[PDB]
Amino acid sequence: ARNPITITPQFDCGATNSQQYVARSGDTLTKIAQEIYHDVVGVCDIARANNLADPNRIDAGTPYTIPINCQTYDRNSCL
Amino acid sequence: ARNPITITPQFDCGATNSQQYVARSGDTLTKIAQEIYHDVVGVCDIARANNLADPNRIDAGTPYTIPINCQTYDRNSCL
Ligand SMILES: CC(=O)N[C@@H]1[C@@H](O)[C@H](O[C@@H]2O[C@H](CO)[C@@H](O[C@@H]3O[C@H](CO)[C@@H](O)[C@H](O)[C@H]3NC(C)=O)[C@H](O)[C@H]2NC(C)=O)[C@@H](CO)O[C@H]1O
Ligand SMILES: [Cl-]
Ligand SMILES: [Cl-]
């Protein structure tokens, strides 16, 4: 019923918008994606958005780009 | 650098995906949008998605549709 629109993604997951999230001690990608962001992004979307090799290595005090409006969600391909 | 894609929004905010969130006692649209969903949706996007008459009035135990990948965010037009 709504008209289709064309968007230009900034991430492979199709997201156009993002936030900067600074990891806290004890944060993991699963906690960030699933709890802090209430599962609106996949753990592996975050990893690819940040060009991360190992998704289990997250550094306290480092900002991570969180794509917040993905069209698709990759929860485990990088796992 | 990525190629544009065409999507069909299911909500006025441009979102294609959503979740159901069941309001807890004490919940408000503000705390749902800003804390639970970490600002990835606007208070007024939630109100419009659920055809809420009063954005200040939500019912404990009632499920609400949360558009999770809006293109635009409406934080206050309905307030
Ligand atoms: C847009 C926004 O965030 N507005 C905030 C107000 O919603 C909030 O007021 C409180 O709102 C809640 C949710 O509507 C009210 O709780 C509901 O109360 C009714 C009647 O008592 C009850 O039937 C519902 O079960 C119950 N729902 C929930 C989820 O608890 C509550 O009464 C409102 N409180 C006051 C004082 O008006 C106010 C205050 O925090 O802030 C706005 O920003
Ligand atoms: Cl990406
Ligand atoms: Cl809507």
Author numbering:
A (entry chain A), B (entry chain B): 1 to 79
Question: Please, what does the article write about this entry?
Answer:
The LysM effectors Mg1LysM and Mg3LysM, with one and three LysM domains, respectively, have been characterized from the Septoria tritici blotch pathogen of wheat, Z. tritici. Intriguingly, however, Mg1LysM was characterized as a functional homolog of Avr4 that protects hyphae against hydrolysis by host chitinases. The crystal structure of Mg1LysM from the Septoria blotch pathogen of wheat, Zymoseptoria tritici, revealed that chitin-induced dimerization of two Mg1LysM protomers through high affinity binding is required for hyphal protection against chitinases. Since Mg1LysM also forms ligand-independent homodimers, a supramolecular structure can be formed in which chitin-induced oligomerization of Mg1LysM ligand-independent homodimers form a contiguous Mg1LysM higher ordered structure that is anchored to the chitin in the fungal cell wall to prevent hydrolysis by host chitinases.
To this end, Mg1LysM was heterologously produced in the yeast Pichia pastoris and purified based on the presence of a His-FLAG affinity tag. The large Mg1LysM crystals that were finally obtained by micro-seeding techniquesbelonged to the space group P 61 2 2. A native dataset was finally refined to a resolution of 2.41 Å with an Rwork and Rfree of 17.96% and 22.03%, respectively. The structure model comprises in total four copies of the complete mature protein sequence except for the first amino acid after the signal peptide for chains A to C and the first two amino acids after the signal peptide for chain D, and one carbohydrate molecule per asymmetric unit (a.u.). The compact LysM structure is stabilized by two disulfide bridges between Cys44 and Cys78, and between Cys13 and Cys70. In addition to the single LysM domain, Mg1LysM comprises a relatively long N-terminal tail that contains a short β-strand. The four Mg1LysM monomers within the a.u. form two pairs of homodimers that are each very tightly packed. In addition, the crystal structure revealed that the N-terminal 12 amino acid tails of the homodimer run anti-parallel and form a small but stable β-sheet (5ITI7 of each chain) that is stabilized by clustering of all four isoleucine side-chain residues and by threonine-threonine sidechain hydrogen bonding, potentially strengthening the homodimer. The latter hypothesis is further supported by the formation of two additional salt bridges formed between Arg2 of one subunit and Asp12 of the other one.
